Amino acid sequence: HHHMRVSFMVAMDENRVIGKDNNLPWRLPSELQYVKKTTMGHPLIMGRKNYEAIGRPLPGRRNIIVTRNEGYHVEGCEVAHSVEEVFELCKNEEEIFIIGGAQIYDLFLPYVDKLYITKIHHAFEGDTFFPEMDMTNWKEVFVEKGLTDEKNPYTYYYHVYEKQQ
Numbered sequence: 001h002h003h004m005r006v007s008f009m010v011a012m013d014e015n016r017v018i019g020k021d022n023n024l025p026w027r028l029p030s031e032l033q034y035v036k037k038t039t040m041g042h043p044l045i046m047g048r049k050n051y052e053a054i055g056r057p058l059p060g061r062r063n064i065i066v067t068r069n070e071g072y073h074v075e076g077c078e079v080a081h082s083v084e085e086v087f088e089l090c091k092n093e094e095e096i097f098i099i100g101g102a103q104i105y106d107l108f109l110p111y112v113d114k115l116y117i118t119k120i121h122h123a124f125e126g127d128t129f130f131p132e133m134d135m136t137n138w139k140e141v142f143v144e145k146g147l148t149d150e151k152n153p154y155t156y157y158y159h160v161y162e163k164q165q
């Protein structure tokens with residue numbers, strides 16, 4: 001029904017870990033820069049827990065926080081309380097990025113068209129995971145080696161998938 005492209009933006013390890021104790025288990029500033037470059041201009045949709053672990057809105061974008069809390073407000077961020085209310089807020093957007101966490105990924109899982117998954121070649125201790133997906137009708141269209149250096153001490157790859165339907 002909706003008219004915007006729904007895209008997932010995720011970074012996960014070898015066992016699909018995405019978080020430990022409300023934190024990225026890894027420090028990869030270059031990966032975060034890729035996320036900034038890829039999502040520039042477009043709304044960011046994130047769960048309340050994902051937002052609070054991030055701490056502040058991030059400029060040049062509509063930041064949309066998903067919560068059941070009817071009285072939740074954050075300076076310079078928009079609040080939505082359901083998938084449909086996000087779809088409302090984003091009705092004239094060309095593309096929106098679902099940036100986590102796990103519960104918010106589950107929430108939009110039936111709607112995802114495009115998949116930006118950074119795969120990190122390491123097995124981290126973690127408590128939150130990227131959900132399993134039926135990859136039937138999905139095609140990998142892009143893969144590139146991420147920057148490994150002193151500041152970014154792991155091997156990782158940018159993968160993109162498009163749903164064929």
Ligand SMILES: NC(=O)C1=CN([C@@H]2O[C@H](COP(=O)(O)OP(=O)(O)OC[C@H]3O[C@@H](n4cnc5c(N)ncnc54)[C@H](OP(=O)(O)O)[C@@H]3O)[C@@H](O)[C@H]2O)C=CC1
Pocket residue numbers: 009010011012017018019020021022023024046047048049050051053066067068069080081082083099100101102103104105107128
């Ligand atoms: N590497 C990666 O790709 C990323 C990692 N992460 C990590 O994952 C963790 C966050 O994921 P997780 O803990 O699952 O939390 P979420 O980010 O999914 O936030 C959960 C919150 O979303 C709100 N919510 C959930 N379902 C609904 C619903 N159906 N309707 C309305 N609101 C809803 C609730 O907010 P409320 O309680 O206020 O009502 C809930 O507490 C963090 O540790 C973070 O570091 C997150 C994103 C990306």
Ligand SMILES: COc1cc(Cc2cnc(N)nc2N)cc(OC)c1OC
Pocket residue numbers: 009010011023024031032035036053054058098099100118
């Ligand atoms: C917008 O940048 C951030 C993004 C994330 C989550 C995240 C990080 N990387 C990828 N590829 N996808 C995601 N959903 C987490 C962050 O910190 C906890 C960020 O800022 C510091």
